[PDB]
Design a protein around this ligand. Structure first.
Ligand SMILES: COC1=C2C[C@H](C)C[C@H](OC)[C@H](O)[C@@H](C)/C=C(\C)[C@H](OC(N)=O)[C@@H](OC)/C=C\C=C(/C)C(=O)NC(=CC1=O)C2=O
Length: 214
């Protein structure tokens, strides 16, 4: 329908600024963070399902799926985890500074590896290493499908989703890659990052590859 617009908490805006404007070299850790987040979302729905089995019926398969969309310069990271409601997207992705935002920034300026970002509970924002824009598309059993969108600006939008494929249940991180980071559309490069930083993931990690038939 129509978008609602929200302002980022001052700390989160600062964090995004740091990250988006970094010379940092090890940018590939963004994928470890998103996969770990995906894995956590999958842990949640599975634990929930222990005493509420019906929760799984909206998407019985538990998986992490990565889909490069080279034409649009887009990389998607999807999971069939618990998903997030409209209120969760608003409350947890910007309007309330995470418990570790300022501390991570303090740590960063002291010499800390950007890769520590996950230990501070703000690793979602690492996607800004390789992307200048992001849509978080999410369907929780408890709500309708919604789109959360940010370009690292000081505000984000949340919109009821009438334009994307239905996700049964879970979350798509749709990354609009920067022009210098298009290597992450490549099958070989993706595979390599996964093997190096994400060896111990309990769920299948699927890669969607689009090849011309000869
Ligand atoms: C331990 O929980 C985690 C927290 C608290 C987080 C808001 C919990 C959230 O609400 C309670 C859901 O329960 C949880 C299932 C949803 C995800 C992990 C989403 O990931 C996917 N694929 O669904 C993630 O990204 C879309 C949303 C925000 C992540 C933040 C801002 C971050 O920077 N790091 C974090 C990583 C975490 O694991 C973090 O803060």
């Amino acid at each position: 329908m129509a978008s609602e617009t929200f302002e980022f908490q001052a700390e989160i805006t600062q964090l995004m600024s740091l990250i988006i404007n970094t010379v940092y070299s090890n940018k590939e850790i963004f994928l470890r963070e998103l996969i770990s987040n995906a894995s956590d979302a999958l842990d949640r729905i599975r634990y929930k399902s222990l005493s509420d089995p019906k929760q799984l019926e909206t998407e019985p398969d538990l998986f992490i799926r990565i889909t490069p969309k080279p034409e649009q310069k887009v990389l998607e990271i999807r999971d069939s985890g618990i998903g997030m409601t409209k209120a969760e997207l608003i409350n947890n992705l910007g309007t309330i500074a995470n418990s570790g935002t300022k501390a991570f920034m303090e740590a960063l300026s002291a010499g800390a590896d950007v890769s520590m970002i996950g230990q501070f509970g703000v690793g979602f924002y690492s996607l800004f290493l390789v992307a200048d824009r992001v849509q978080v598309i999410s369907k929780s059993n408890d709500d309708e499908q919604y789109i959360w969108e940010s370009n690292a600006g000081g505000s984000f939008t949340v919109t009821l989703d009438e334009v994307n494929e239905r996700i049964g249940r879970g979350t798509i991180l749709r990354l609009f890659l920067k022009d210098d980071q298009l290597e992450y559309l490549e099958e070989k490069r993706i595979k390599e990052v996964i093997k190096r930083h994400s060896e111990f993931v309990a769920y299948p990690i699927q890669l969607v590859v689009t090849k011309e038939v000869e």
